[PDB]
Amino acid sequence: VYQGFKVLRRNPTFYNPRSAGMVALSYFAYSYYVNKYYKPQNSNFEEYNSSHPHNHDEKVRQYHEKTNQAIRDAVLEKRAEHDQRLREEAKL
Amino acid sequence: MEFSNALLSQTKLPGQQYDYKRCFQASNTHFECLDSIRDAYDNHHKCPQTYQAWQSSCDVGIRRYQMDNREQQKKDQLLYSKEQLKNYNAAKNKEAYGITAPKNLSFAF
Amino acid sequence: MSIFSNIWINNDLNSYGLSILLLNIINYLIVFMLILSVILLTNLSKFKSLNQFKEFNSYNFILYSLIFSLLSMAGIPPLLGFTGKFLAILYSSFKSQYLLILFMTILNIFGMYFYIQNLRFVVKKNKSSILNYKNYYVNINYSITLNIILLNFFNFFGILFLSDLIIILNYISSYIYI
Amino acid sequence: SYSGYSLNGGVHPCLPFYERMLQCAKSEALPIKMCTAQTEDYLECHHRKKQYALNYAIKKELNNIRIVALPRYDEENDTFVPFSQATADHIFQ
Amino acid sequence: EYLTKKTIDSFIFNNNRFNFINLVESKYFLQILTLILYLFFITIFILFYI
Amino acid sequence: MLTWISFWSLIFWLILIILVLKPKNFISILFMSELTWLALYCLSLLFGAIYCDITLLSISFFILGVAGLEFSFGILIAILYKNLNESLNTDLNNNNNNQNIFDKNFKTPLEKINWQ
Amino acid sequence: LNIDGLHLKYNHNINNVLYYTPSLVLFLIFFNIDYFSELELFLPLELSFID
Amino acid sequence: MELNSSAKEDSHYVGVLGYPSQHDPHTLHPKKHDSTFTKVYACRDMLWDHHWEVRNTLYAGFKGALLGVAYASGFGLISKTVPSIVLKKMFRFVRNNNFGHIRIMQDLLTPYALTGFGLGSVYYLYQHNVWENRSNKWLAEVLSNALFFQVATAVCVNPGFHIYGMVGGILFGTLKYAFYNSSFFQEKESIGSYTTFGDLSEEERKKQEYKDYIQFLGNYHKVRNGQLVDL
Amino acid sequence: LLRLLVSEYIFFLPVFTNLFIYWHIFFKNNINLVNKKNNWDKSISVKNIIIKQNPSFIIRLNLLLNSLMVLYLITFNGYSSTFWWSHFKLNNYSLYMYLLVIIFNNYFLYITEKHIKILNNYSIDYFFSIINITLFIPMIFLSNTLFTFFFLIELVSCAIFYKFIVSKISFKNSNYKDNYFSIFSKNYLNVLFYQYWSSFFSSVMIVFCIIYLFSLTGSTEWSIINFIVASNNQINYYTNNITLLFICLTLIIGFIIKLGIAPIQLYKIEIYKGLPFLSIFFYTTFYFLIFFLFFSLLFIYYLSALNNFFWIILLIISIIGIFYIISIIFDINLFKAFLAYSTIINSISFILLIIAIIF
Amino acid sequence: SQTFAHDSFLGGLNLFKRRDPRFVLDQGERPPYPIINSNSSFVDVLSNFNKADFGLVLFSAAIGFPLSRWVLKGLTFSSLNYRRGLFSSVYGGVILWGLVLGFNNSYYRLNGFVDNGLVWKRKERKLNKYDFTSEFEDNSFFKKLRIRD
Ligand SMILES: CCCCCCCCCCCCCCCCCC(=O)OC[C@H](COP(=O)([O-])OCC(O)COP(=O)([O-])OC[C@@H](COC(=O)CCCCCCCCCCCCCCCCC)OC(=O)CCCCCCCCCCCCCCCCC)OC(=O)CCCCCCCCCCCCCCCCC
Ligand SMILES: CCCCCCCCCCCCCCCCCC(=O)OC[C@H](COP(=O)([O-])OCC(O)COP(=O)([O-])OC[C@@H](COC(=O)CCCCCCCCCCCCCCCCC)OC(=O)CCCCCCCCCCCCCCCCC)OC(=O)CCCCCCCCCCCCCCCCC
Ligand SMILES: CCCCCCCCCCCCCCCCCC(=O)OC[C@H](COP(=O)([O-])OCC(O)COP(=O)([O-])OC[C@@H](COC(=O)CCCCCCCCCCCCCCCCC)OC(=O)CCCCCCCCCCCCCCCCC)OC(=O)CCCCCCCCCCCCCCCCC
Ligand SMILES: CCCCCCCCCCCCCCCCCC(=O)OC[C@H](COP(=O)([O-])OCC[N+](C)(C)C)OC(=O)CCCCCCCCCCCCCCCCC
Ligand SMILES: CCCCCCCCCCCCCCCCCC(=O)OC[C@H](COP(=O)([O-])OCC[N+](C)(C)C)OC(=O)CCCCCCCCCCCCCCCCC
Ligand SMILES: CCCCCCCCCCCCCCCCCC(=O)OC[C@H](COP(=O)([O-])OCC[N+](C)(C)C)OC(=O)CCCCCCCCCCCCCCCCC
C-alpha cells in the first residue's frame, strides 16, 4: 500500500474494536445455537424411520406413510380385478 | 383448485400441445363403436382397435372429460325424454306467473 | 353433503360466498360512484373538511342525493348497502360463524355512526353556492345529473331487482371450480 | 412455471417425475389421493429430504464407534480386497 | 346516560389521546416493521405454545 | 458457521431492519432499498443454483431492472425535495419532540409574544 | 445534496435499547426457515461422489 | 395450525382409525440393568408429564412472561418515555461496563416479565381450579375471562378502565370458546362421518339407509307441501 | 422450436393494437404544436401559440378502444386452457373478470369525460396514465403464475405512480394575498413518498414469497402450487410449518402494505389527502375492483390449498384492524380522510366475509 | 339456416350468434363444427381469409368514420393539420381493429368454433332440461342471436 502508514494510521484494525468483538461473538453464538439446537429440532431426524418412534410427529408421519401404502395397494388390486372382469366380459 | 379436474387438465407441460382434430376423430370413432355396442357400462375392451387409437390420439385429461360427459349423457337419457322435458318446462314457465301460497293445516308429517 | 347407499346429495352451492363478495364490492362501488358523481357535479375546492358537509346544503336534488348516499353507505335497511351487509351476515350464519357475525356487527354499527355523524354537519345556516360559474351562470351538468338519478333509482330499489344481480353473479362465479 | 431446463440448457433432472405426476393428476379422478407415489417421488427429486435424513443417520453412526477400516479398492481388476491384505498400491505397504 | 353513551365516548377520546393526527415517516416505517416482526412472533407463539 | 440458505434468509430481514432503524433520511433509505434489492438478487441466485431453476437464475436481471427504476424514482423525489422545501431528514419536517435528536428546536416566527 | 457531509445529530442508543434489541432477539430466537440444509464438513467429502 | 389440539381430540375416532393418539403416556421406562447416568437422564419425562400442577403453573407463567417481554419489546417500552438524565446515566453505564446492554434489557423487561408471569400463573390456577367442571362451557369461559380481565385492567393499567377490561374479557372469552375450546378451522374429522358396530349385513345397512333417505326427502319444502309439477 | 401456434398469442393481438394506437396518438399529440409555415404559405388568421388542449378527445379514444375490447371479448371463442408457456390462463371465470373490469372502467371513463367537459383541471398526461392503467390492469386476472402476476402488478403500480406524478399542483384561484409570500404545501411529496415506499415494501416481500414458493414447489403456477400443497398435506413429506407460515405471512403482509388495510392505513390517509377528487375516483375503482378482488381470490381460488394457515392470520389482522380503527375513524376532520376510512372499513368487512367464505 | 353463409360478406355476423353464453369451451368438449386445422399458424390463418373477413374489415371501415368524428368532437385548441392527423390515426386504429376481428374470425373458422361450412357426421344433441329462454326467444327478437341444435 503506497503510503501505507499514512493510510492505516487512523484505522489499523477497527474503528470500534469492542463493537466488532461483540458482533463476532453474537454471530458465533447465534450460529452455534441455530445449528446445534434449532434447525435439528425442526428437521426432526433423530427418530426418523424409527421402528418405535417416541415422537408424535414421527408417529404421525409413519401413520401417513403406511396409510398411503395401504390405499395404493388396495386400489391397485381393485383396479386389476375390475380390468380382469371387463376383459372377461368383452369376449362374450 | 387442487381438487378441480378441469383446472388440473388445463395444466400442461411447457412444450405440450394437443392435436384436437386427430383426438376428436379418434374419440368420435370410439364413441360410435360404443354406442353401437349400446351397453349400460362402457366396456372399452369390446372395441380394442378404436380404443387403442383413442388412447393414442387423445390426452388423459381430454379422455377424462369425455368419459364424464358420456356418463352424464347416459344418466340424462335414462332419466328424461325430449317431449317430457319440453312439457315440464312449459308447465313450470306457466306456473311461474302465478304465486305459491302456503298450504295451511296440512295432513302429512 | 349426505350419503345414502353411496349416493351423494349436495344441498349447498359452494360458489356462493364468492358471489356474495362480488355483490358487496359492486354495491360499494355503485354507492361510491354515486357520492363521487354528486361531488364532481359541484365545485371541488369547497369540500376540504367534515365541517364542509354543510356545503352540500344546496338545492333539493343535491341535498337529498347526498343524504341518501350517506345513509346507503351507512347501511340503512331500504338502501343498497343494506343488501350487501345483510347478505354477508346471512352467509356468515349459513357458514355458522357466530364470532365473525359479532365482529361484523360491531364494525357495521361503528361505521354506521361514522357515516351518520356527517348528517349533523350537513345542516347549514343558509343555502350554499358550490356550483362553478360559466358564461356568468352556474354550470349544471345534465349528463351527470342523469347518471346520479339512475344511481339514485338503483340505490332506492336495489332490493326489488337484486335477485337478477344475484343470479348473474352466481352464474359468473360457478365457472370457478372451487 | 416449470420450464424443465437445466442450468446449461439441458433438461431439468426432475422432468420425468414432473411428467409422471402431471399425467397421474390428469388421469385420476381423485388425483390428491391417487397420485401420492408420483407426487412424493417428484418432491423427493426436488427437495432431497430423505437423502438428508440418511446423511444425518450416517453421521450419527460414524460418530458411534463401529467402523475401523474399509476394504481397499483394486481398480485394475475392479474388485474390493480386505484392508488386512497387503497390496502394492496400499498406502502403508 | 353515562354507562351507555359517555363510556364509549370517553373510550374513544382516551384512545385518540394516543393517536397522532398527522402521519410521519418514522411512525410509518416503525409500524410496518412492528407488524412484520410481531405478527410473525404471535403466529409462531400460537404454533408452538412453548 | 451458518449454511448459505439460512444466512441469506436471515440477512434479508436484517437489512430490512437496518433500513427501518437508521434515521429517516431519504438518500439513506434509498441506499438501503438498493441493498435490499441486491440481497434478494443474491438469494434468488442461490436458490436457482440449488434447485437448477433457470427462472430463479433469470430473476436476477428482473430484480436489477426494478431496482434501477426505483432508484431513478428515488433520485427524482430527492431532487424534488428542494423545490417542495422539505429537509431530507424527515424527522425535521414535524414539530414533534424527539429525544433521538440532540438539537431539535423550533419556534414560531415571532420576536415578542407580549406587546403591552 | 449534503456536499459538506454534515448529517443529523442522531442518537441510536435510545431506540436500540427501547425497541430494536429485544425485537431482534425475539426474531432471531424464533426465525429459521432453513429446513434441513447441511453445512460443509457435516460428512466427509469422500462420501460425496456425484461431482 | 391448531390451538389446544390435545384437549379437543376424538379418542374413539382416532382409535378406530388407528391414528396415533395424543393421550399416549409419552413416558420413559429405564431398565434396571441400565447405567446410573441413563437412569438419571430418564427422569426428564417428568417435564412432559401433563398431570403436574406445578409444572403446568410454571408453563403458564413462562408463557405470560414471554408475552409480557414481547409486548415490552414491541409497544410498551417504545411508547413510554424515559427521562433524559436516566437515559444518559444508563448510556454511561453501557460505556463503562461490558455487556451493559444485557443489564439494561434485564432492568427494562423485569416489570413486564414479572407481571406477565404473575398473570399467567394466576390465570392458569384460576381456570383449572375453578370453571374446569362447569356445565355451560361458553358461559363459564365468558364469566371467568370477564372477571379476570376486569381485575387485571383495574390493577395493572388503571382502576378506572375496569369496565373496558370486563368487556374485553367477554370478547376474549367468546373468541377462546370459538377457536381454542372448539374446532372450527382445526377439523380432524369429515362432516357426517361415523363408525359401524355390530353384526349387521350390508343388505340390512342398505335398507336402513334407504329408509333414512326416504325420511330425508321430507326435508325439502316442495315435496313436504306437495307443490311439485308433474314431470 | 419448430411451429409457433396462433393459440399461444391470439389474445395478445387486441391489446398490442390498442397499445400501438394509444402510444402513436400520444406521440402525435406531444408533437402537435409543431407545424411549419412555408414561405409561400398564407395564414388566414394569426396563429395562437398559447394552447391548452382539453383531454376530452383522449378520454373518448380510451372509451372507444375499451368498447372495441368489449366487443372482442363478446365475440371471443376458444378452448379453456393456458397460453404462452402456461403463464396466462384462459377460462370463463378469468374472462368474465376481465370483462367486468373493462365495463366498470368504461363507465367511470364516461363519467370522467362528463366532468372534464364541466371543468378542466387535468392534463393530457393524466389521462394517458389512466389509459395505460386501464389497458394493463385487467390483464392481471389472466395471470396463471405468481411471477407474471407480480410483473403485471408492478407495471400497474408504475402506471399509478405516473398518474400521481401528473397530478395538478398549482391552481389559479381567487386568493391574491400570497403573491409575494412563500406558501409550503407538502401534499405532493407526501403522496409520492408514501406510494413509492409502500410499493417498495410490497414488491420486496412479494419477490421473497415468489422465491420461497419456487423453493417449496418446482414451479409457481397456481394449479401446481395447490396440487403440491395438498399432496404434501396428504403424504406428510414436507412438514416445515415454520416455513409455510412465514411464506403465508410474507405474502399477506406484502398485500396489506400494498392495499393499505387497517394495520397499515395512515399512509393511505395521507395519499387520499394529497390526491385530487378525480384521482380518488379512479383509484378507489382500481383498488376495489382489481387489487382487493385478487387479494380475496388468493385465499378463495388461487392459494386455497394454504387456507389452513391463512385463516388465523386473517382473523388476527381483522381483529387488530377493527380495534385500531374503532377510535381513529372518529378522530379525523377531513373529507379525504373520511373517504379513505370508508374504504378501510369496507375492506375490513370484506376481509371478514373472506374468512367466512374460506371456512 | 340460422347462420349466414361463411363465404358471404355477411358471414362475419355469426360471431354474435352463440349457442351458450360461455366464453370458451371446456378442455375436451368437441367444437360445434368439424375442425379444419387445430394447429394453425399465422401464415395459414392469413391464407384462410375469406369474404366474411373482408366484410368485417369493410364494416370496420364504415363504422370508423362516425366513431372517429365522435372522438374528434372533443378536441380543442387544435390546428387543421393536427385535427386531420388525429382523425386519420383514429380511423386507422378502427380499421386495424377490424383486421384483427377478421383474423380472429378466420382462426375460429379454422378451429370449428364458428360456422365453417362443415357439419359433424353425428351430432351430439343435448337434453334441454333447463329452459328459461326457448319460448321467450321464439316470441321475441333474440331467437336470431342464439344457435340451437
Ligand atoms: C340491484 C343493483 C343494481 C345495480 C346497478 C348499478 C348500475 C346503475 C347505474 C348505471 C347503469 C348503466 C346506465 C347506462 C349507461 C350510462 C350512459 C347512458 O346510457 O346514459 C347517457 C345517455 C344520455 O343521452 P342524452 O342525454 O340524450 O345525451 C347524452 C350526451 O349528450 C350524448 O351521449 P354520448 O354521445 O356521449 O354517448 C351516448 C352513448 C353513451 O353510452 C355509453 O358510453 C355507455 C357507458 C357505460 C358503459 C358500460 C355499460 C355496461 C352495461 C352492462 C351492465 C353493467 C352496468 C355497470 C354500470 C356501473 C359500472 C361502473 O349512449 C348509449 O349508447 C347508451 C347505451 C347504454 C347501454 C350499454 C349496454 C352495454 C352492454 C355491454 C355488455 C353486454 C353483455 C355481454 C355478455 C357477455 C357474455 C359472454 O342516456 C341515454 O341515452 C338514455 C338515458 C335514460 C335511460 C337509461 C337506461 C339505463 C338502463 C341501465 C340498465 C342496467 C342493467 C340492468 C339492471 C341490472 C340490475 C338488475
Ligand atoms: C446472527 C445475526 C446477528 C449477528 C450479530 C450482529 C451483527 C449484525 C447486525 C445487523 C442485524 C441487526 C442488528 C440491530 C442491532 C440493534 C441494536 C443493538 O443492540 O446493537 C447496538 C449495539 C450498540 O452499539 P454501539 O453503541 O456502537 O456499541 C456500544 C458498546 O460497544 C456495545 O457493547 P455492549 O456489550 O454494550 O453490547 C453487547 C450487545 C451484543 O451482545 C453481546 O455482547 C453478545 C451476546 C451473545 C449472546 C449471549 C447469550 C447466550 C448465547 C447462547 C448460545 C448457545 C445456546 C445453545 C442452546 C442449546 C440448548 C440445548 O448486547 C446486546 O445486544 C444485548 C443482548 C445480548 C444478549 C442476547 C440474549 C438472547 C437470549 C436470551 C433468552 C432469554 C433469557 C431469559 C433469562 C435467562 C436467565 C438465566 O451494537 C453492538 O454492540 C454491536 C452489534 C451487536 C448486535 C447484537 C444483536 C442481538 C443478538 C445477540 C445474539 C442473539 C443470540 C440468540 C440465540 C441464542 C439464544 C440463547
Ligand atoms: C385480587 C385477587 C387476585 C390477585 C392476583 C395476584 C395474587 C398475588 C400473589 C399472592 C399474594 C398473597 C397475599 C399477599 C398480599 C397481596 C396483596 C398486597 O400485598 O397488596 C398490597 C396491600 C397489602 O400490603 P401491605 O399493606 O403492605 O401489607 C400486607 C401484609 O404484608 C400482608 O402480609 P401478612 O403477613 O399479613 O400475610 C398475608 C397473608 C394473607 O393471606 C390471605 O388472607 C390470602 C387468602 C385470602 C384471599 C383469597 C383471594 C380472594 C378470594 C375471594 C374472591 C372474591 C371475588 C368476588 C367477585 C364477584 C364478582 C364481581 O398472605 C400471605 O402472606 C400468604 C402468602 C403465601 C404464598 C402465596 C403464594 C402465591 C404465589 C404466586 C405469587 C405471584 C407473584 C406475582 C404477582 C405480581 C403480578 C401479578 O393489599 C392490597 O392493597 C390489596 C387490596 C385488595 C382490594 C381492596 C380490599 C378492601 C376493599 C374491598 C374490595 C372488594 C373487592 C372484591 C372483588 C370485586 C368485587 C366487585
Ligand atoms: C500490504 C501492505 C503492507 C504495509 C502496510 C503498512 C505497514 C506499517 C503500518 C501498519 C500499522 C498502521 C499504523 C499504526 C500507527 C498507530 C499505532 C497504534 O496506535 O497502534 C496500532 C494498533 C492500535 O489499534 P487500536 O486498538 O488502537 O484500534 C482502534 C483504533 N481507534 C483508536 C482509531 C479506534 O495496535 C494494535 O492494535 C496492536 C494489537 C492488536 C493487533 C491486531 C490483532 C488481531 C489481528 C491479527 C491477528 C494475528 C494472529 C493472532 C490471532 C489468532 C490467530 C489464530
Ligand atoms: C356477546 C354476548 C355477551 C354476554 C354477556 C355476559 C355477561 C357477563 C357478566 C359478568 C359478571 C361478572 C362475573 C361473574 C362471575 C360469577 C358467575 C357465577 O357465579 O356463575 C357461575 C355459575 C355456573 O353455572 P353453570 O355453568 O354451572 O350452569 C349454567 C346453567 N345454565 C345452563 C342454565 C345456564 O352460573 C350461575 O349460577 C350464574 C349464571 C348467570 C350469571 C350470573 C352473574 C351474577 C353476577 C353478580 C354476582 C353477585 C354476587 C354477590 C354480590 C352481590 C353484590 C353485593
Ligand atoms: C338479414 C340481413 C341482415 C343484414 C344486416 C347488415 C347490417 C349489419 C351491421 C349493423 C350495425 C348496426 C349499428 C351498430 C352500432 C353503430 C354505432 C354508431 O354508428 O354510432 C356512432 C356513435 C358516434 O356518435 P353519433 O354518431 O351518434 O353522434 C354523436 C353526436 N354527439 C357527440 C353530439 C352526441 O358511436 C358512439 O357514440 C359510440 C361510442 C363508444 C364506442 C362504442 C363502440 C361500439 C361498436 C359496435 C360495433 C358494431 C356491433 C354490431 C352488432 C350487430 C349484432 C347483430
Ligand SMILES: CCCCCCCCCCCCCCCCCC(=O)OC[C@H](COP(=O)([O-])OCC[N+](C)(C)C)OC(=O)CCCCCCCCCCCCCCCCC
Ligand atoms: C402486460 C403487457 C401486455 C400483455 C403481455 C405482453 C405479451 C408479450 C409476449 C408477446 C409474444 C408475441 C410473439 C409473436 C411471435 C409471432 C409473430 C407472428 O405472428 O409472426 C408470423 C410470421 C411467421 O408465421 P408462421 O409462424 O406461420 O411462419 C412459419 C410457417 N412455416 C412453419 C409453415 C414455415 O412471422 C414472421 O414472418 C415475422 C417474425 C417477426 C419479424 C420481426 C418483427 C419486428 C417488429 C418490431 C416492431 C415494429 C413496429 C412497427 C410500428 C409501425 C407503426 C409506427
Ligand SMILES: CCCCCCCCCCCCCCCCCC(=O)OC[C@H](COP(=O)(O)OCCN)OC(=O)CCCCCCCCCCCCCCCCC
Ligand atoms: C477485478 C475485476 C473487477 C472487480 C473489481 C473489484 C474492486 C474492489 C474494490 C475494493 C476497494 C478496497 C479499498 C476500500 C475499502 C478498504 C476497507 C475499508 O474501508 O474498511 C471499511 C470496513 C471496516 O472499517 P473499520 O471498521 O472502520 O476498520 C477498517 C479496517 N481496515 O471494511 C470492512 O467492512 C471489512 C474490511 C476488511 C479488511 C481486511 C484486510 C485484510 C488484510 C490482509 C493482509 C495480508 C494477509 C492476508 C492473509 C490471508 C489469509 C487467508
Ligand SMILES: CCCCCCCCCCCCCCCCCC(=O)OC[C@H](COP(=O)(O)OCCN)OC(=O)CCCCCCCCCCCCCCCCC
Ligand atoms: C362482547 C360483545 C358485546 C359488546 C357490547 C357490550 C356487552 C356488555 C355485556 C355485559 C353488560 C352488563 C351490564 C353493564 C355493563 C356496563 C357496566 C356497568 O353497568 O357496571 C359498571 C358499574 C361500576 O361503575 P363505575 O366503575 O363507577 O364507572 C365506570 C368508571 N370507568 O358496576 C360495576 O362495578 C360492574 C359490576 C359487574 C356488572 C354487573 C352487570 C349486571 C347487569 C344486570 C342487569 C342488566 C342485564 C342486561 C343483560 C341481560 C342478558 C343479555
